Symmetry: D3
Amino acid sequence: TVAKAIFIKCGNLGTSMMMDMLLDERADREDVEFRVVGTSVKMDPECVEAAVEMALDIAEDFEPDFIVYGGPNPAAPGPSKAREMLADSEYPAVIIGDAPGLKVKDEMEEQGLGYILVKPDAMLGARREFLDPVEMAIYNADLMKVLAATGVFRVVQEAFDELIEKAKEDEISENDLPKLVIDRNTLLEREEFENPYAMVKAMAALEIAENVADVSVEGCFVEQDKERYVPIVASAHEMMRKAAELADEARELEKSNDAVLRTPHAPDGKVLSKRKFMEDPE
Amino acid sequence: TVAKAIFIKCGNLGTSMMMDMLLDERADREDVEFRVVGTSVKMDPECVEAAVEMALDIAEDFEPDFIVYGGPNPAAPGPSKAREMLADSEYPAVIIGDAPGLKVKDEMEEQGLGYILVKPDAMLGARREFLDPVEMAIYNADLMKVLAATGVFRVVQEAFDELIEKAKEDEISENDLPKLVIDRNTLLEREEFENPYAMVKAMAALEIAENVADVSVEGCFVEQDKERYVPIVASAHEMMRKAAELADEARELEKSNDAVLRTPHAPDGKVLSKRKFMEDPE
Amino acid sequence: TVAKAIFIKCGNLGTSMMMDMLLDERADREDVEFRVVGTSVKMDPECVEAAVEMALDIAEDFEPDFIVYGGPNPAAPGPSKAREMLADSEYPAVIIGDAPGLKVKDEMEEQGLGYILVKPDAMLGARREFLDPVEMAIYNADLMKVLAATGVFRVVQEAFDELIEKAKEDEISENDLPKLVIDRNTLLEREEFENPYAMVKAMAALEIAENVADVSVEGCFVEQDKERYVPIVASAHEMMRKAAELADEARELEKSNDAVLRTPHAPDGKVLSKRKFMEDPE
Amino acid sequence: TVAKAIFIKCGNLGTSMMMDMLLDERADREDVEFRVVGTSVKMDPECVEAAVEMALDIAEDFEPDFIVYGGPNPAAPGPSKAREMLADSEYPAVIIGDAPGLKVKDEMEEQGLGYILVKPDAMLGARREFLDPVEMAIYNADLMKVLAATGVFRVVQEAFDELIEKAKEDEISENDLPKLVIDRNTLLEREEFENPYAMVKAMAALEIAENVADVSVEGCFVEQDKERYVPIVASAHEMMRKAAELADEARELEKSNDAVLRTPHAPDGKVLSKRKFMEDPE
Amino acid sequence: TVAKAIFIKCGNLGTSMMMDMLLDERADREDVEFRVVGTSVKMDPECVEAAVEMALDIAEDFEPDFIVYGGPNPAAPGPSKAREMLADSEYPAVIIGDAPGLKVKDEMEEQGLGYILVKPDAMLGARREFLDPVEMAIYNADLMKVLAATGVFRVVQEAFDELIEKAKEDEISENDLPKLVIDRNTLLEREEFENPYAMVKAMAALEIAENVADVSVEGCFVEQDKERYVPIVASAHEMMRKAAELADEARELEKSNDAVLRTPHAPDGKVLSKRKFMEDPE
Amino acid sequence: TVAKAIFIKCGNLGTSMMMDMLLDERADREDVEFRVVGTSVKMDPECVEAAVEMALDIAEDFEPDFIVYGGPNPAAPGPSKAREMLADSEYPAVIIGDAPGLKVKDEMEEQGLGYILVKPDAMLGARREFLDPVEMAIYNADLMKVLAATGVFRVVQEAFDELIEKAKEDEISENDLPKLVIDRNTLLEREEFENPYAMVKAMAALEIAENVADVSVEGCFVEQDKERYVPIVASAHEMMRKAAELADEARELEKSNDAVLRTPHAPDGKVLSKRKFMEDPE
Ligand SMILES: [Mg+2]
Ligand SMILES: [Mg+2]
Ligand SMILES: [Mg+2]
Ligand SMILES: [Mg+2]
């Protein structure tokens, strides 16, 4: 049959920005249908409510098997509000956030919602003297490349593909809701990379990515001297740029061996697989 | 004065992906309020329709000073549908798209619509054999790095920022709507780069992102032999990855001359500017 | 048997610069003898004729099995004159040219001439303000790498050596003359690369090289505003530099797989073959 | 007035391959007229003689102010033969060779001819097991990039341009004939590079290119064990590839400072000069 | 007056490997005289005791003005014995260590010892399965590149140069001994880089280097699973390799601005200074 | 049985800096015990003698099985005094040096001393106007990287490990002492690289490094003009930097084939071996 879900996006995150598209890359999955609503970058308690009310507003006629909320710091005012509104609705919800979301990690099991906490999806150096729109874009391009090439996006894809199957089974229980925490070590469980050094390079990429957070936090919430915080947050961007280079390096190693894992979606939604370039998705 | 807008996102394009965030990079603007709605990757006449209705729906109470529709190919069934829906509504609308929209450029002005066509925002190789979620994301990472580091996003931002000023003047006419077609030569009319070699590299990056389109189509809708179109779409990706490298290069040149242009928004919406890293934006 | 030929070089084309040397790379080939005549970069109607005359003059005593004319744009005043002069001669001939020669592909087949059209051998951005002597050399370096590392030169070689064999059968008929149009898609129907990704990188590299031509054309003829054509002709050169680096990346990929295809000429003229580095060519 | 000269090319050398073209880059120099003749790669005493015989043969009606012979090792059988025939003609000649030509350096002062010996124009790894047509082209592309970007070609261009002036004065005396030896230290008497590190990098690139010859020679003429000579010549080619990278790196520094030295020819033949990209050749 | 000191090296740290050499880079200083002793890489109490006793026996007749002990973890048993032994002597002493030394910072002050703790001097992935002699050297090469190119070594050089001047006046009090903790933020207050982006890339390099320590600790002392720790320590090395490239990029930015800081020693000990390449130090 | 040795370090050489460490990479060997003494960068006769006397004085109660002296030029005055002193003692001794040691090769054999001369271990551009501490450290970082990644250090490790086993049997004869001369060709007959291009790239790195010596020598002892020798020595440092990148390139190829050789020491001193990342050493 056909499964449906709603995506609410407040504020920006590398994972939230891509989460719904990781489910139907070519737009040929006839077995799903999604809606996307949000308040852009804004994520204060007010805008959040309005967004979740905009999702509950259309879920009435849309009737989503599950709703997903994606944004930074799920333990902050704005996002906290939205955890409430979704925990108390006739819809199974999933909250996708970053590392600060480990604070309210217990509280999320309580509210009965699923979650995808990406640690390497670090906050960017948000300081007016440094972060303008373009810098903002450049940083996201480097983070997108590290989360994709290291195989973290695969984890999110497969997590929302294993749910979309239980959604067609007309049985979405809280035991079916994912409870994930993505980090460098997560790659130690997969078989993503055939070349071991590629895994080690992807691991290093994610380690660096996770570290970008502390640098951005310090420069934005701790250092108050212009002469010190501008360079600090900028150094957080230089780090992520390198993590992106490491990610690319990992991918190229897999190209040298012709083992680049590829798992596309069949028109009916079933996840295929392949390693060799001219292999034809199995 | 507080301007309002509604972004309709159907299908995916690099420009539509970040278009709204380019207007409030740090979420500190208190002169704007946005509501984003879309049907994700799917952009057929059915989904597109439901999305615009969804946007017009909330537009009654939101009261946007304008509505923006972004997605690939404005000449396609769905986009054309949305193009007539917005033209017939009492809302000043803008259409953001790729090269394929040119076929309906003279047609959009008659509908009284504003448009911004980004030629280098090329369609990716959407073959099930090559394009899986990861690959799609990686593709957009490079495409984003391109549109950002080459100055194209600052063009989009500039156009909308000037529009948001008009939206405050309580007067948005067909003359105040943007009618731009971005391409490699668009940089010739700007002073984005201080280093002349940074610009020509930037131009090369956009010229190459532009050619990527021909290959993606030649392998998605033209060629039908399995043994040819897979290598064809993958070759379009390699082109995008190197285009992104030329963009990174150009920016590193602006970094060596400490002439990296940054144009961040003040809390009141005012667009500041600076070249030197240590200088505050004025 | 010892085949012979006379290459006429008028103008500058990457394929005409190497054409004869790809036939006797180590100069230890004793089954062939060549004579090279030309008037340097000048390819005007006068110089072109004075060149073909020298070739026809030398051919009297030399007595070649065929005569090759290499230079840019066979459909120009100079090349056209030479195209006709050779057709009227008693000597078989082949025309080495770029994309601009396709205009006269049908005509050359009528004149009974043979031809090899290399689409990716793009014209350089010749605009006094940019293309000085050094820059010209530089551009030709990148292009030489692209045509060499992608496999285009091996296609040229396999065609000219297949002809020299028929030239030993002292009977070269128009049916034995080459009629090739090299471009990105040529690699698709070959086995140059053992590594798949090295192939699509080579294909990506060839597409870019081809696309440089239009850029150089736009800036050398169409655009007449100095403030714009200087940047444009330079952007085309930054593009070919990228194409060269891409070709290099492809060769290194073959190296990681110890599969660099090498096909050297034995002292007798036979084309040997090898993959593995320490493997003898047979 | 108008100056003329003939160029004989036997065997290949990076400088011998570009020599003529470095004097008329766009082919719009009306004050010169060149002719090019040779036997391709072959350079044995027989082929050489037939080549210098074909140059003197056309020099009858062409009446050249000076003839130039270019090819590897001007102290070998073939080339030595050509020094004889040119020293014994009514035409002033210039011998273009590589480092092995310093052996017959004094003997050439005696024969009364000029010479340009480029030390960094190293011999390649000419072994059947390594050097095929493709590899041979890859090497010349690297060599071409270093000879150009390091500013060596500029030295050769200036030399033949200072001669083409004294050739319009119909006074080509042996004193006006060039007696040059070019190597790493040539850059110390130049102004080629404004950035001191770009010069330093170029010096290193030349030093390495020069040292490549010693490796090639060993692998080709000294090491007789196939298991050792193949890797040796192959390493000589890896060295040249990095030299090309260093040269390129020097050029990029110059772009960074907007000081890329350009010396294009004026339509009448006088060498112009400029630094800034948009400066307009003066 | 000649300044005398004894350096003791037990175990290995980047900073301790180069500490004494940074004080006499050309070996032409006439104001210093050094003795270096140690037990190589072994830093257990037994060996460290022999090392210090070796130094104290030498001090008898050599009469140094100060003694330096350098090696990892000032808090470990072996280094602790050295601190105890040095604290009990009459010779002013300094402890060079890494992050773990912070645990005994209070103890060192109470012991009258000086110290320089370099946090970016990270412990390597010391697991037999991954660290052999060559990998150990590779890591050191990268670490050295990071500490030198970021400017950390100039901080250490600086500290000791002042201590040496005071020694020449036989007046080294406990309050003269350095108490430095070096890390990413140390660079914020140095006039090391003229290019702001070079400082930011360098800060990024030091941040990543510091991060390496944590990753090496996890793989060597926490994770006990062979399958998990081998990849973890190898990823630690990948991070250091990338940190080295950042330091290298910063160094190349200074070169582009012909602003690389050099502070060589004059024959009489005076520390000169310069920026421009051809500028003489003073 | 535990082997004991003393290492004497005077002056600085890449190999003398790492020698002892390569023998106990993780400090977990039970079969060895070393003592290190030296006079830092100073290697004049007075200092060298003071150093050797320190060693021989320790030797009395330490009872070393063999003594190693490492540092620049075994033929210089200082090093020569060391050779005379050690050749005059009862302790078997090995001299670690650079190319200039070849001069006293016969003299060393007549003295009953062993030797390992590392030709690529080149002297740096030791000119005050260029070489300050930071640059000295950066040069050694690249040289170390070269000596490690190319396998030169593995050769050094092997020579000493063999000598160590002999020591454990109290049987070190003058015929057991090494007489090695390491250079580019040394790599031709080792098992180091599985990939041939990695071996080739490693050879290229050694050739360039070996060549760096001559450039530094020219700039330090021959050229006397500040305006010539500054750029000269600096170009020696740019060469080394590229030799390091080639060594890194060779290492990355091995990683692509998961054939990176690692020969770690077992606790009992046994030299293990492995190739595959996940493969345990045996
Ligand atoms: Mg005291
Ligand atoms: Mg006390
Ligand atoms: Mg003895
Ligand atoms: Mg004896």
